Ligand binder design. Structure first.
Ligand SMILES: [Mg+2]
Ligand SMILES: [Mg+2]
Lengths: 239, 239
DNA sequence: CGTGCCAGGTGCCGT
DNA sequence: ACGGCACTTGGCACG
């Protein structure tokens, strides 16, 4: 079928081969319901025993294997990986990524369903409420930080690390912002501390770090105060 | 129902409702190829225009929407979400996470396929090469760091943060390790630096930080040296 | 390309 | 639950 969808339940091997072939050839979406084994070797090494999973191969090369639980595929393979279907005692999907070299091997013990989905999507996701949006707010409304704040750079490389927003205040200090779109953790305060220390090595003792977020974890608040750093409450804007 | 798979191409709304509702009640995997619009509101806010996607709803509430590219769902919902099918101008899949309130709405414009996959999986993933396994190696073979190293605590909480490994050396110094199973970057060093500074205040300047990892980024090397910390090369072990 | 970092990050484990 | 952090993190923007 050259309808959007082809489905075959309990395929024969040649049926199985046929659909996998066409999926790849047509830049379609291959979906398989099968009982399988999965072997991964790559950055790490992985084994998964016999069980039912859903398998998806995207035309861009992405490979997903999902069990009945979580949000995360049990094994996978990133965009740009090449897949082929080898016939050994059972059919085996083999997907290889290079740089770094990673091979994914799915032995298909029984294929309950194979399907080809020739999917048209021209639309891109529009997302609001991000950190960049916070940045834009600050550049178009600096008073949202403090009065007379003068934002200068965004995503600026200082020597070691990249600062979210860099600027000055009314009294002439350098001011660093670390923004976070959620509750700020130790991770963030360490970013901020790191930057501020580097800027001090040049502009000496007049520099302020300011952590801009909707809130802080206990430890963030703790460490923040300890190192004499500041916090301003800010929500990411939605539009 | 006994069949692993139930699938219907071009299903009527009646047929859709049957299988969708069966999927939830039977606690099975729902799979749908469809033309759809997507609306997300939650931590952020999101709009996806009309186009074709694969949709998976797992019995544990996890909800996936995959376009024909990348590895990441364009929208999703975490485990423990609750989904209902709603009949409005078109069928709408509605997944609601509470705690934090997050709403996903999938308007099904045309459903090309709906399927129920009753998947039996008793197997769990066995992965090796983790950072945890790095730590285990070090406690079994402390010499992989340096002669005379005596590892003592693992994931030990110092006042602010949690140190991966705390130990002592031949000079009887307190020693911090941060482990990375892959090439270490600036925040690895920031972590280490953070911990060490905290301990220096208790135990003095004797205290050594060591970054333990298969390799370093240029930037990490730079900050490491600048702060007088150390680097030991270690590859994560694979069973 | 490698470096650095956000992400609706997710998952895990501790208190 | 909140916290602190690893993850085969993935994906992006920038030098
Ligand atoms: Mg930053
Ligand atoms: Mg660690």
């Amino acid at each position: 079928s050259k309808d959007k969808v082809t489905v075959i339940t309990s395929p024969s091997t040649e049926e199985l081969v046929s659909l996998v072939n066409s999926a790849l050839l047509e830049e379609a979406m291959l979906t398989i319901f099968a009982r399988c084994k999965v072997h991964y070797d790559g950055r790490a090494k992985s084994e998964l025993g016999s069980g039912d999973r859903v398998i998806i191969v995207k035309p861009d090369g992405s490979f997903l294997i999902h069990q009945s639980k979580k949000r995360e595929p049990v094994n996978w393979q990133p965009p740009g990986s090449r897949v082929r279907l080898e016939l050994r005692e059972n059919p085996v999907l083999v997907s290889i990524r290079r740089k770094p070299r990673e091979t994914l091997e799915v032995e298909l013990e029984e294929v309950y369903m194979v399907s080809v989905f020739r999917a048209e999507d021209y639309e891109e996701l529009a997302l609001t409420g991000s950190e960049a949006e916070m940045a834009e707010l600050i550049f178009e409304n600096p008073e949202v930080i403090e009065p007379g704040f003068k934002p200068l750079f965004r995503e600026k490389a200082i020597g070691t690390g990249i600062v979210a927003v860099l600027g000055r205040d009314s009294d002439g200090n350098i001011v660093v912002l670390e923004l976070k779109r959620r509750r700020a953790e130790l991770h963030a305060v360490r970013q901020l501390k790191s930057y501020v220390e580097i800027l001090r090595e040049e502009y000496g003792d007049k520099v302020r770090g300011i952590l801009v977020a909707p809130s802080l974890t206990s430890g963030a608040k703790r460490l923040l105060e300890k190192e004499g750093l500041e916090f301003r409450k800010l929500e990411p804007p939605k539009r």
